[PDB]
Design a protein around this ligand. Structure first.
Ligand SMILES: *[C@@H]1O[C@H](CO)[C@@H](O[C@@H]2O[C@H](CO)[C@@H](O[C@@H]3O[C@H](CO)[C@@H](O)[C@H](O)[C@@H]3O)[C@H](O)[C@H]2NC(C)=O)[C@H](O)[C@H]1NC(C)=O
Ligand SMILES: *[C@@H]1O[C@H](CO)[C@@H](O[C@@H]2O[C@H](CO)[C@@H](O[C@@H]3O[C@H](CO)[C@@H](O)[C@H](O)[C@@H]3O)[C@H](O)[C@H]2NC(C)=O)[C@H](O)[C@H]1NC(C)=O
Ligand SMILES: *[C@@H]1O[C@H](CO)[C@@H](O[C@@H]2O[C@H](CO)[C@@H](O[C@@H]3O[C@H](CO)[C@@H](O)[C@H](O)[C@@H]3O)[C@H](O)[C@H]2NC(C)=O)[C@H](O)[C@H]1NC(C)=O
Ligand code: A1ADU
Ligand code: A1ADU
Ligand code: A1ADU
Ligand SMILES: *[C@@H]1O[C@H](CO)[C@@H](O[C@@H]2O[C@H](CO)[C@@H](O)[C@H](O)[C@H]2NC(C)=O)[C@H](O)[C@H]1NC(C)=O
Ligand SMILES: *[C@@H]1O[C@H](CO)[C@@H](O[C@@H]2O[C@H](CO)[C@@H](O)[C@H](O)[C@H]2NC(C)=O)[C@H](O)[C@H]1NC(C)=O
Ligand SMILES: *[C@@H]1O[C@H](CO)[C@@H](O[C@@H]2O[C@H](CO)[C@@H](O)[C@H](O)[C@H]2NC(C)=O)[C@H](O)[C@H]1NC(C)=O
Ligand code: NAG
Ligand code: NAG
Ligand code: NAG
Lengths: 171, 322, 322, 171, 322, 171
C-alpha cells in the first residue's frame, strides 16, 4: 500500500476483531483481547458512505430511451442515430469503469493511511516507555494494566507516570 | 505486557480491481451494476402497456381484420409489438411517413377510436362494401376495419365531398388510402372516371393525389397498389375530403392524448400482474443501482446501461486473514 | 524554549465538497462557475445584431408590411427574434424548406436588398397591384413588400418569362410564391387559364408548379393558399421564371454574405450600448471562467454550459481557527 | 487527512500566521512570533496555480451553439437533435463535477503532506536535542536563541553544537 | 560503516506533464499517441481497395466514358475517390438520392456488372445510338456506358415495356435517367409524343415520371436536363420499365454483395504493395497505441483520434542525476 | 513529492544503480557498491505495467469511421452530424489528456512512497544501533560486514547481536 501499513509492516489482518476496521490487541496480567478503535472506524465509515453515495448521485436516472425506425431511403440518418447511441455508450462504459478503478485505489490507500496514523498516535504517546517489536506491536517497559491500556486507546497515556519505572527496565 | 495495532479481516471472498492490481480480495464491497430482471412485462408506474398482439403499429392503426379488435378507449404507459407481428398492411403499397407516425405515437398515452364518417350516412351515392382477398378474415375476403373502399354505384361515381370538424378537444389522427389499379379497364370499372383525383385539406395540410396506372409485380397476389396517408387534425380544425375516384375513405379516427415517458418496444415476454418503475424488453428491473447491463432499451426510471460485466466498489480493506 | 510547526487559518467561510466529505470550510478557494450576466443584448465582438422586431424570419424575408422596413444593407453578428413575433406569413400557405432557409441564414453576416425585377418595367402585360386583407397595413389591404401579385390585364394573362443574371459576386436569395385559388371561377378570373403552370429554373434548380384547386378551411379569412419557395442563385448563374398564371413574382432579392460564429436566438431582452465576447438570450457574459450555468444557447466565445449550481476548487487548506 | 497532520496531531491552524500556508512559531528568551516557511508555501502556490490553470485549459472555449428548428414531419430528427444536446450536457456536467471533487480531495491531501514533511524536516534535524511535546511542538533541551531558531527554519541546524548541553538537560 | 537508501537515475531526457507540474524529466516513460504513418494506400486485412481514378461514385455508376473501364467483377475493402474527380455526371441534371446511394455503397464489398437489358435485343422498335457532346470520349460525342438513350425509330416511338427478374441471389442496383428537352419541338422530334411518361415499378418501388419542358441556362452547353434515379431490386423481385418517351434506359446493372468495415474516403495517396490493419486518407498506421493524431477518418482497426500533440505516461521516477 | 523522499530528504538519484528503481549503497571495510532492491522494484514494475495496460484496455479499438455527404437542402442534418463528430472528439481528447495527467501524478507519488517505505524498513530494523546522518544514509555504531549488510537488505537484521557493541560506540 501507499502508506506501508496494510500488507506492509503489519503483515496480516485480525479475524478476531469483528467490531471495527482498525483497533488494538493487548496482553497484560489481567488477560488479552481485541478492541476496535470506534472513532477512526466510524469516521472511515462516514467518508466511504459519502464516496459511494457520490458515485450514485453523480449518475442521473436514465429516463425512457428507446429506438427509432428508418425507411430504406434514410440510411444516413439511421447510421447517424446509431453513431450517437454507440458513442454515448462508449463514453459511459468508459466513465463507469475508470471511476470505479480510480476510487478503488483511493479507498485502499485511505484504509492504509488510517492504520498508519493509528500506529503513529500510539508510538508518539509511548515514546521510550515501550519498544517497537515489529508487526505493529509494542512491548511496555512497565506493568501496563487495563486502565493504562485504555489510556493508550483514547488520547490520555500518562508518560511521566511510568518514566521512572520504564527507565529502570530499559537497562 | 504488549499492545498491538491491527486491522479487520474476515471470511469475505469479494474481489475488486484497481489501477495497479487486479483481483484484490477485500473485506467489504458494494455492487453498482444491476444484472437481474424478472423476465416479465409489468405495469409501469401503475399503468398497463398497450399490447398489439399479432399486429404492428400499421395493422392496428389501419384496423387489419386479422387482429383482435381493441376496446374503444385505451390508456397505457408503453406500446409492445411482438417480434412476429404477422399482421401489418395487407393490401400492398406505401405507408407515407410511417416512421414519423410511429414517433408521434411514442408520446401518446391514450386513444379514443370513434366513427369520423359513419358508414351508412356518409356515402349514399357510392358503394362501400368493397373487400379483397389480400385482407382476408376467417378465410373470407375482408377489408380494414377503419377504412372504406368506395366504388361506383349504379354505374356512376359522383364527385364526393365530406368534412369533419374536430370538437374533441384533442388531436384527431385521420388515416386514408389511395388505390392504384393495375390497368385502365379496372380504373374505369371501379371509379368510372379516368382523370380521377383525391383532395384532402385542413388548415395546415393541403395535398392532391392522382392514380398512376401500371401493371406491377404481384404482392400478396395483387398487382394493384394502395398508398396510405395520415395527418393530425388540430382541435377545432376541419378536414375536407374531395374525390371523384380511388379514395379509400376514413371511417374511424383516433382522438389522441399526449403523455410523458412512453415509447414503443419489441418483446416476446408476457404480461404479468406486477408493477415496476423500470421496464426493458427482456423484463422489469427493481433496483436502485446506478448501472445495469441488461438492455440498452428502457422505459421509466432506470439505471444507466453500460457494456461492463462487473462494477464493484471496495468499501472495506484488503482481506488478509491468518 | 520551543519551536512549533503549524499551518494557516483565517476568517474565510468558503466551503467546498470532496469525495469523502461535504461542506469543508477552507482558507482559500476559486470559483469556476459563471452565474452572472448583465441582462442586456450587446454588440458581439464590436458588431451589432440584427433585430427583427415584430417579424420572424419568414415575415422579414417576404417583407410583411406590418414590420418596420429595414435599411437596404445590414451587417450583423447574430439575429434576434422576439418571442411574440406577431408577424410572419400573412397569406396562409406552406413555406417550403423554411427550416433549411433559417439554417442558411445562420451563417449569413450581411444582406443587400435589391430590386431583381423592377415593378414598372418587368410586367408590362400583367396587373401588378393585387393586395389582400390578410396582409393589411394601417388598416388597409396590402401585400408583401418583396413580392408582386400578378393577375390578368385587360382580360388576358399572357405567358410571361423573365430572367436575372447574378452579377453581384455573392449568393442571391430569390423568393417567390404560388397561389392556389379555392375554386375554378376565381382561377379563371385572376389568371384566365385553367391549365396554368409556373416554371423556375437555374443551373442547379429545376421545378414546375401547378395550381391545385379546392375549397379549404378559412385561415386568416382566406380559403385560398399561397405556397412560398426559395433558392440560392450562385454567382454568375441565371434564374428564369416562366408562368401563364398563379405566380407570385419576386420583386426584391437579397445578396448574401457568409460569415462565422453567427446564429438565430429568441430574446425579450433589450439592445444596449455595450460590447461582449459572449451573448446568451438572457444577457451577455463577461467572464474567463470555464463553466457557466446561465443558458445553453450562446453566441461568441463562452464558458461551457453545465447544469451544476456550484463548482468551487479549494486552493488553500482546511480552515481550523482557534 | 491522508497524512495525519492537518486536523490530526496538529489540531488547529494559526490565524496569526498571515504570510504563508505553512510555517513556524517559536518562543525563547528574546520573545516569540510566527514565521511562514516561504519555500514550501511558494512551491505549493506554484503547483496549485498549475492545477487550476490545467482545469481551465482543458476546457475549450464554447463557440457559437444555438438551436435548430424542425417542421411537424421531422419529429424523429428533432428528438435525435435533442438526444445529442441532452447527452453532451449530461457528460460535461458529469465531467466538471467529478473533476472538481477529485481535485479537491487531492488538494487537501497535498497541503496535509506538506505540513507533515515540514514537521519531519525539523524532527530529523533536532534528534534528541529536543523532545516532542505533541501538537507539532518541540521543547529544546538547550537555550535556543534567534540565530539557532533560524538555523532550524532553514536547513542548517547544528546538532553537534548543542549535544553536550542537551545531554546534560535530558537527565 | 554506512548503508544508504536511494533510487534510480539515468541519462533519460523524457519529459511528462502532471496536474501540479509541467515538464518533469523522468527515467522511463511510454508514448501512447501514434503520430507516424507510411504515406501510402495499402491493402486492408489482405484486400485491395477500389480506386475510382478520374471518376467519382456517380461517374463510375453511370459509366462515364472518360473513365478507364473496370473489370466486370471487383471486390474491395474500401473505396477511394480522388480529390480531383474530373468526371462525374456529364449531362447536366439531378441525381436523386445520390448521398443515400453513396451510403449504400459504403457497406458493399463486391459488384458484378452485368447486362440487364442487352442493347441489340431489348429495343427492336427504338433508336439506341443517341450520343451527346456533353459526354464526349476521345474528342467524339458519346454516352454513358451503362445507359441507353432511346429515341424514335422511323418517325415512331412505340410504347415500350421491359422487365427483369433478379435471379442473382444478391441485390441488383438499377440506374436509369429521364431526359427533359428544352422545348417541345425537340420533345416531339426525339420521342414523337408530347404527353410522354415513364413508369418504373418493383414490389416495393412505384414511381412515375413526366417531362417538364422549359428552356434553362446552359450547363456543359446543354439547355436540356437529365434526372438520374436508382433502386435496389431485391433477390427474386421483378422491375418493370414502361415509357412512351424520355426514358434513358438501363443497359448494365450491378449485383451487389454486402460486407463489413468499409467506407468511402478521399485521398491523393498512391496504391502500394503493402498490407495494413488501419488506413487513413494520409496513409496506413501500423501501431498498437490507443490514440493517434494523424486523421479523424479511419478504415479498419485503428487508434482513437484525438487532437492532442503529446500523450506520454511516466513509468519510471523523476530523474535527478548528480 | 507527496511522501517527501524523492527530491526531498533524499535529494538525488543514483546513475550507478542500473539494475532497479530502488535499492541500497553500502560502504564497509570490504568495499562499497550498489544493490537494487529486487522485491520492491519488481512489485513496482508489475503495478505500473498493470496501470499502462489498463489505460490501453479501457480504450476500445476504433473501427471504421468515415464521413457522410449531404446535398444543398440538408444543411441542418450536416451541421448535426458535424456537431456529433466535434462533440465526441471534444470529450475523448479531454478524457485522454486528463487521464494521462492524473495517472502521471499518481505514478510519481507511487515511486515516492516506495522509496519512503524502503527507508522506513531499514530505519525500523536498525533502531539505535546506527544513526541517521541525513540524505537517506545511516552510519553504523558497529562493524557491519557484507553478511550484516545483506541482513539489512533482506528482512533479517539481528539487532541483539550488535546492541552491546553499538551501545559502547554510541558514547
Ligand atoms: C483471484 O483470487 C482468488 C483468491 O486468491 C483466486 O481463487 C483461489 O485460487 C487459488 C489458486 O488457484 C486456490 O487456492 C489453492 O489452489 C491450489 C492450486 O493452485 C490448490 O492445490 C489448493 O487446494 C488451493 O485450492 C483457491 O482455492 C481459490 N479460491 C477461491 C476460488 O475462492 C482466483 O483464482 C483469483 N482470480 C484470478 C487470479 O483471476
Ligand atoms: C457547512 O458548515 C458551516 C460552518 O461549519 C455551517 O454553518 C454554521 O452552522 C452552525 C450550526 O448550524 C452555526 O453555529 C452555531 O449554531 C448553533 C445551533 O446549531 C447556535 O446555537 C450558535 O449560535 C452557532 O450559530 C454557524 O453559525 C453556521 N455558520 C455560518 C452559517 O456561517 C453550515 O450549516 C454547513 N452546511 C451544511 C452542513 O449543509
Ligand atoms: C524542460 O526541461 C528541460 C530540462 O530541464 C529543459 O531543457 C534544458 O533547458 C536548460 C535551460 O534552458 C538548458 O540548460 C542550460 O541552459 C543555460 C542557459 O539557460 C546554458 O547556459 C547552459 O549551457 C545549459 O544548456 C539545457 O541544455 C536544456 N536541456 C535540453 C534541451 O535537453 C527544457 O527547456 C524545459 N522545457 C520547458 C521549461 O518548457
Ligand atoms: C446499494 N446502494 C444503493 C447503497 C446506497 C448506500 N450505500 S452505502 O454507502 F451505505 N454502502 C456501504 C456498504 C458497505 Cl458493506 C459498507 C461497509 O464497508 N460496511 C458497513 C458498515 O460497517 C462496516 C464494518 C463492519 C464490520 C466491521 C468493520 C466495519 C462495513 C459501507 Cl461503509 C457502505 C450503498
Ligand atoms: C479566475 N481564474 C480565471 C484564474 C486563473 C488563474 N487562477 S489561479 O490559479 F491564480 N487562482 C488562485 C487563486 C487563489 Cl485565491 C490562490 C490561493 O490560494 N492564494 C493566492 C496566493 O496566496 C495564497 C496565500 C495567501 C495568504 C497566506 C497564505 C497563502 C492564497 C491560488 Cl494559489 C490560485 C484563477
Ligand atoms: C507500447 N504499449 C503497447 C505497451 C503495452 C505494454 N506496455 S508496458 O506496460 F509493458 N510498458 C512499460 C514500459 C516501460 Cl519503459 C516500463 C519501465 O519503466 N521499465 C521496464 C522495466 O524495467 C524498468 C527498469 C529498468 C532499469 C532500471 C530500473 C527499472 C523500466 C514499464 Cl514498467 C512498462 C507498453
Ligand atoms: C480515557 O481512558 C482513561 C483510562 O481509563 C480514563 O481515565 C479514567 O476515567 C475514569 C472515569 O472517567 C476515572 O475513574 C479514572 O480515575 C481515570 N483514570 C485515571 C488514570 O485518571 C479517561 O476517562 C478516558 N477518557 C475518555 C474516555 O475520554
Ligand atoms: C540559515 O540560518 C542561519 C542562522 O541565522 C544562517 O547562518 C548565519 O548566517 C549569517 C550570515 O550569512 C552569519 O553572519 C552567521 O554567523 C551565521 N550563523 C552561524 C551560526 O554560522 C545561514 O546563513 C542561513 N542560511 C541560508 C539563509 O541559506
Ligand atoms: C538474508 O540475508 C542473510 C545474510 O546473508 C542470510 O543469512 C545467511 O544465510 C546463509 C545461507 O542461507 C547462511 O550460511 C548464513 O549463516 C546466514 N547468516 C546468518 C547470520 O545466519 C539469509 O539467508 C537471507 N535470507 C533470505 C535471502 O531470505
Ligand atoms: C424471445 O426471442 C429470443 C430470440 O429472438 C429467444 O432466444 C427467446 O427464447 C424468446 N423467448 C420467448 C419467451 O419466446
Ligand atoms: C421574458 O419572458 C419571460 C418568460 O417568457 C419572462 O419571465 C420575463 O419577465 C420576460 N422579460 C421581459 C423583459 O419581458
Ligand atoms: C494532396 O493534397 C494536399 C492538399 O489537398 C497537398 O498538400 C499534398 O501535397 C497532396 N499530395 C499529393 C501526393 O498530391
Amino acid at each position: 500500500g501507499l502508506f506501508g501499513a496494510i500488507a506492509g509492516f503489519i503483515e496480516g489482518g485480525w479475524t478476531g476483531m469483528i467490531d471495527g476496521w482498525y483497533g488494538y490487541h493487548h496482553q497484560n496480567e489481567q488477560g488479552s483481547g481485541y478492541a476496535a478503535d470506534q472513532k477512526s472506524t466510524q469516521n472511515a465509515i462516514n467518508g466511504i458512505t459519502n464516496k459511494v453515495n457520490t458515485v450514485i448521485e453523480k449518475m442521473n436516472i436514465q429516463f425512457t430511451a428507446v429506438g427509432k425506425e428508418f425507411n430504406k431511403l434514410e440510411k444516413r440518418m439511421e447510421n447517424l442515430n446509431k453513431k450517437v447511441d454507440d458513442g454515448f455508450l462508449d463514453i459511459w462504459t468508459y466513465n463507469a469503469e475508470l471511476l470505479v478503478l480510480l476510487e478503488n485505489e483511493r479507498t485502499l490507500d485511505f484504509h492504509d493511511s488510517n492504520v498508519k496514523n493509528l500506529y503513529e498516535k500510539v508510538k508518539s504517546q509511548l515514546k521510550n516507555n515501550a519498544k517497537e517489536i515489529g508487526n505493529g506491536c509494542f512491548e511496555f517497559y512497565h506493568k501496563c494494566d487495563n486502565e493504562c491500556m485504555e489510556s493508550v486507546r483514547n488520547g490520555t497515556y500518562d508518560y511521566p507516570k511510568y518514566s521512572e519505572e520504564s527507565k529502570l527496565n530499559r537497562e | 505486557d504488549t499492545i498491538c495495532i491491527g486491522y479487520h479481516a474476515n471470511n469475505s471472498t469479494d474481489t475488486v480491481d484497481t489501477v495497479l492490481e487486479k483481483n484484490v480480495t477485500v473485506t467489504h464491497s458494494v455492487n453498482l451494476l444491476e444484472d437481474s430482471h424478472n423476465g416479465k412485462l409489468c405495469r409501469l408506474k401503475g399503468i398497463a402497456p398497450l399490447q398489439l398482439g399479432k399486429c404492428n403499429i400499421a395493422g392496428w392503426l389501419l384496423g387489419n381484420p386479422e387482429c383482435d379488435p381493441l376496446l374503444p378507449v385505451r390508456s397505457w404507459s408503453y406500446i409492445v409489438e411482438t417480434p412476429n407481428s404477422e399482421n401489418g398492411i395487407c393490401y400492398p403499397g406505401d405507408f407515407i411517413d410511417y416512421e414519423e407516425l410511429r414517433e408521434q405515437l411514442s408520446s401518446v398515452s391514450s386513444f379514443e377510436r370513434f366513427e369520423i364518417f359513419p358508414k351508412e350516412s356518409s356515402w349514399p351515392n357510392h358503394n362501400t362494401n368493397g373487400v379483397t382477398a389480400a385482407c382476408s378474415h376467417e378465410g373470407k375476403s375482408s377489408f380494414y376495419r377503419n377504412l372504406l373502399w368506395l366504388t361506383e354505384k349504379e354505374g356512376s361515381y359522383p364527385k364526393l365531398k365530406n368534412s369533419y370538424v374536430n370538437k374533441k378537444g384533442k388531436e384527431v389522427l385521420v388515416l386514408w388510402g389511395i388505390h392504384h389499379p393495375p390497368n385502365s379497364k379496372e380504373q374505369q370499372n371501379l371509379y368510372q372516371n379516368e382523370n380521377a383525383y383525391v383532395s384532402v385539406v385542413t388548415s395546415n395540410y393541403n395535398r392532391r393525389f392522382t392514380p398512376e396506372i401500371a401493371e406491377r409485380p404481384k404482392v400478396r397476389d395483387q398487382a394493384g397498389r394502395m398508398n396510405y396517408y395520415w395527418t393530425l387534425l388540430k382541435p377545432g380544425d376541419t378536414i375536407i375530403f374531395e374525390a371523384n375516384g380511388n379514395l379509400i375513405a376514413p371511417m374511424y379516427a383516433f382522438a389522441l392524448s399526449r403523455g410523458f415517458g412512453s415509447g414503443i418496444i419489441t418483446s416476446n415476454a408476457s404480461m404479468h400482474e406486477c408493477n415496476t418503475k423500470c421496464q426493458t424488453p427482456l423484463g422489469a428491473i427493481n433496483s436502485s443501482l446506478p448501472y445495469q447491463n441488461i438492455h440498452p432499451v428502457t422505459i421509466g426510471e432506470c439505471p444507466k446501461y453500460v457494456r461492463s460485466a462487473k462494477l464493484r466498489m471496495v468499501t472495506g480493506l484488503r482481506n488478509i486473514p491468518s
